Protein backbone atom coordinates (compact mmCIF):
# COMPACT_ATOMS: atom_id res chain seq x y z
CA UNK A 1 0.00 0.00 0.00
CA UNK A 2 1.51 3.29 -1.17
CA UNK A 3 1.30 6.18 1.29
CA UNK A 4 2.70 9.68 0.93
CA UNK A 5 6.18 9.87 2.39
CA UNK A 6 6.13 12.49 5.16
CA UNK A 7 9.85 13.11 5.20
CA UNK A 8 12.99 11.86 3.48
CA UNK A 9 13.48 9.34 6.30
CA UNK A 10 9.92 8.12 5.74
CA UNK A 11 10.59 7.84 2.01
CA UNK A 12 13.67 5.73 2.70
CA UNK A 13 11.64 3.43 4.95
CA UNK A 14 9.01 3.07 2.24
CA UNK A 15 11.66 2.31 -0.38
CA UNK A 16 13.04 -0.49 1.78
CA UNK A 17 9.55 -2.02 1.68
CA UNK A 18 9.16 -1.53 -2.09
CA UNK A 19 12.50 -3.22 -2.74
CA UNK A 20 11.96 -6.04 -0.22
CA UNK A 21 11.40 -8.49 -3.09
CA UNK A 22 13.31 -9.40 -6.24
CA UNK A 23 11.45 -7.33 -8.77
CA UNK A 24 10.61 -3.63 -9.05
CA UNK A 25 7.24 -2.00 -9.61
CA UNK A 26 8.53 1.03 -11.47
CA UNK A 27 5.27 2.95 -11.48
CA UNK A 28 4.84 2.55 -7.71
CA UNK A 29 8.42 3.57 -6.96
CA UNK A 30 8.16 6.57 -9.26
CA UNK A 31 4.85 7.54 -7.65
CA UNK A 32 6.19 7.47 -4.09
CA UNK A 33 9.29 9.40 -5.11
CA UNK A 34 7.13 12.01 -6.78
CA UNK A 35 4.87 12.16 -3.71
CA UNK A 36 7.71 13.11 -1.35
CA UNK A 37 7.67 16.89 -1.19
CA UNK A 38 11.27 18.00 -1.15
CA UNK A 39 12.20 19.56 2.18
CA UNK A 40 15.68 21.10 1.95
CA UNK A 41 16.37 20.84 5.69
CA UNK A 42 15.99 17.05 5.48
CA UNK A 43 18.68 16.63 2.83
CA UNK A 44 21.05 19.55 3.48
CA UNK A 45 23.50 17.08 5.01
CA UNK A 46 23.91 15.32 1.67
CA UNK A 47 23.91 18.36 -0.57
CA UNK A 48 27.65 18.82 -0.87
CA UNK A 49 28.60 20.74 -3.99
CA UNK A 50 31.85 21.01 -5.88
CA UNK A 51 32.72 24.16 -7.79
CA UNK A 52 33.73 22.42 -11.00
CA UNK A 53 31.39 19.46 -11.53
CA UNK A 54 28.39 17.70 -10.17
CA UNK A 55 28.79 15.49 -7.12
CA UNK A 56 27.31 12.16 -6.06
CA UNK A 57 26.39 11.86 -2.40
CA UNK A 58 25.28 8.51 -1.05
CA UNK A 59 22.22 8.72 1.18
CA UNK A 60 21.20 5.09 1.74
CA UNK A 61 22.63 1.76 0.62
CA UNK A 62 19.26 0.11 0.52
CA UNK A 63 18.80 -3.51 1.29
CA UNK A 64 21.35 -4.86 -1.14
CA UNK A 65 18.89 -4.20 -3.94
CA UNK A 66 19.24 -0.39 -4.44
CA UNK A 67 21.49 2.74 -4.09
CA UNK A 68 19.94 6.09 -3.12
CA UNK A 69 22.03 9.20 -3.65
CA UNK A 70 21.80 12.93 -4.05
CA UNK A 71 23.47 14.65 -6.97
CA UNK A 72 24.39 18.33 -6.69
CA UNK A 73 24.70 20.32 -9.88
CA UNK A 74 26.29 23.72 -9.89
CA UNK A 75 25.23 26.21 -12.53
CA UNK A 76 26.14 24.80 -15.93
CA UNK A 77 27.13 21.37 -14.57
CA UNK A 78 26.06 18.35 -16.53
CA UNK A 79 26.69 14.69 -17.12
CA UNK A 80 27.96 12.64 -19.98
CA UNK A 81 25.60 10.81 -22.26
CA UNK A 82 25.40 7.56 -20.33
CA UNK A 83 23.71 4.23 -19.76
CA UNK A 84 22.63 2.66 -16.45
CA UNK A 85 24.33 -0.74 -16.43
CA UNK A 86 21.22 -2.89 -16.71
CA UNK A 87 19.68 -1.14 -13.72
CA UNK A 88 16.62 0.97 -13.05
CA UNK A 89 17.23 4.67 -12.64
CA UNK A 90 14.78 7.01 -10.93
CA UNK A 91 15.65 10.70 -10.83
CA UNK A 92 13.64 13.08 -8.64
CA UNK A 93 14.27 16.81 -8.55
CA UNK A 94 14.77 18.17 -5.05
CA UNK A 95 15.75 21.72 -6.06
CA UNK A 96 16.00 23.57 -9.36
CA UNK A 97 15.55 22.19 -12.86
CA UNK A 98 17.46 19.75 -15.01
CA UNK A 99 17.41 19.21 -18.74
CA UNK A 100 17.23 15.55 -19.72
CA UNK A 101 18.23 14.74 -23.30
CA UNK A 102 17.40 11.28 -24.61
CA UNK A 103 19.52 9.34 -27.08
CA UNK A 104 19.14 5.98 -28.76
CA UNK A 105 21.80 3.31 -28.42
CA UNK A 106 24.34 3.92 -31.19
CA UNK A 107 24.95 1.56 -34.07
CA UNK A 108 28.38 -0.02 -34.55
CA UNK A 109 29.03 2.58 -37.26
CA UNK A 110 30.71 5.77 -36.06
CA UNK A 111 28.11 8.52 -36.32
CA UNK A 112 26.85 11.63 -34.58
CA UNK A 113 24.46 10.79 -31.77
CA UNK A 114 21.34 12.80 -32.54
CA UNK A 115 19.05 13.55 -29.63
CA UNK A 116 15.66 11.83 -29.71
CA UNK A 117 14.03 14.37 -27.45
CA UNK A 118 14.60 16.59 -24.49
CA UNK A 119 12.64 17.77 -21.53
CA UNK A 120 12.87 19.96 -18.52
CA UNK A 121 12.56 18.14 -15.24
CA UNK A 122 11.14 20.45 -12.60
CA UNK A 123 11.17 20.54 -8.81
CA UNK A 124 9.60 17.43 -7.26
CA UNK A 125 9.14 15.64 -10.59
CA UNK A 126 10.46 12.07 -10.88
CA UNK A 127 11.81 10.72 -14.17
CA UNK A 128 12.68 7.12 -14.96
CA UNK A 129 15.11 5.53 -17.37
CA UNK A 130 16.60 2.15 -18.10
CA UNK A 131 18.78 0.80 -20.89
CA UNK A 132 15.73 -0.57 -22.75
CA UNK A 133 14.45 3.00 -23.07
CA UNK A 134 17.78 4.47 -24.10
CA UNK A 135 20.60 6.69 -22.95
CA UNK A 136 20.48 10.17 -21.50
CA UNK A 137 22.37 13.26 -20.58
CA UNK A 138 21.31 15.33 -17.57
CA UNK A 139 22.32 19.00 -17.30
CA UNK A 140 21.78 21.97 -15.10
CA UNK A 141 21.58 24.62 -17.78
CA UNK A 142 20.74 27.37 -15.30
CA UNK A 143 23.16 30.27 -14.98
CA UNK A 144 21.84 31.26 -11.56
CA UNK A 145 20.32 28.26 -9.73
CA UNK A 146 22.07 25.13 -8.48
CA UNK A 147 20.06 21.93 -8.84
CA UNK A 148 19.78 18.97 -6.51
CA UNK A 149 18.37 15.59 -7.51
CA UNK A 150 17.63 12.33 -5.73
CA UNK A 151 18.63 9.24 -7.69
CA UNK A 152 17.63 5.66 -6.98
CA UNK A 153 19.46 2.88 -8.76
CA UNK A 154 18.43 -0.75 -8.62
CA UNK A 155 20.45 -2.88 -8.50
CA UNK A 156 23.27 -0.63 -7.29
CA UNK A 157 26.08 -0.06 -9.76
CA UNK A 158 29.27 1.96 -9.68
CA UNK A 159 30.32 1.81 -13.31
CA UNK A 160 28.63 2.86 -16.51
CA UNK A 161 29.54 4.01 -20.01
CA UNK A 162 29.98 7.52 -21.28
CA UNK A 163 29.21 8.00 -24.97
CA UNK A 164 30.98 10.36 -27.35
CA UNK A 165 28.24 12.42 -28.97
CA UNK A 166 30.40 12.80 -32.10
CA UNK A 167 30.78 9.04 -32.78
CA UNK A 168 28.68 6.90 -30.45
CA UNK A 169 31.84 5.33 -29.08
CA UNK A 170 31.63 4.37 -25.43
CA UNK A 171 34.09 4.26 -22.57
CA UNK A 172 33.67 2.66 -19.17
CA UNK A 173 33.63 5.10 -16.27
CA UNK A 174 33.84 4.31 -12.57
CA UNK A 175 31.62 6.58 -10.54
CA UNK A 176 32.90 7.97 -7.28
CA UNK A 177 31.05 9.13 -4.20
CA UNK A 178 31.79 12.66 -3.05
CA UNK A 179 30.27 11.77 0.30
CA UNK A 180 28.55 8.90 2.05
CA UNK A 181 25.94 9.33 4.75
CA UNK A 182 26.87 13.01 5.08
CA UNK A 183 30.60 12.33 5.41
CA UNK A 184 32.96 13.69 2.78
CA UNK A 185 34.84 10.79 1.24
CA UNK A 186 37.94 12.09 -0.64
FE1 LIG B 1 21.49 8.77 -15.76
Curated annotation (Swiss-Prot):
It comes from the Eukaryota. Induction: By increase of sulfur amino acid intake. There is a cross-link at residues 89-153 (3'-(S-cysteinyl)-tyrosine (Cys-Tyr)). Pathway: Organosulfur biosynthesis; taurine biosynthesis; hypotaurine from L-cysteine: step 1/2. GO terms for biological process: cysteine metabolic process; L-cysteine catabolic process; L-cysteine metabolic process; lactation; response to amino acid; response to azide; response to cAMP; response to ethanol. InterPro entries: CDO_1, RmlC-like_jellyroll, RmlC_Cupin_sf. It catalyses: L-cysteine + O2 = 3-sulfino-L-alanine + H(+). Fe cation binds at residues 82, 84, 136. Its EC number is 1.13.11.20. Keywords: Dioxygenase, Iron, Metal-binding, Oxidoreductase, Thioether bond. Highest levels in liver. Significant expression also in kidney, lung and brain. Binds 1 Fe cation per subunit. Ni(2+) and Zn(2+) can be used to a lesser extent. Disulfide bonds: none annotated. It holds the Pfam family CDO_I. Its cofactor is Fe cation; Ni(2+); Zn(2+). GO terms for molecular function: cysteine dioxygenase activity; ferrous iron binding; nickel cation binding; zinc ion binding. GO terms for cellular component: cytosol. Catalyzes the oxidation of cysteine to cysteine sulfinic acid with addition of molecular dioxygen. Monomer. Belongs to the cysteine dioxygenase family. This is Cysteine dioxygenase type 1.
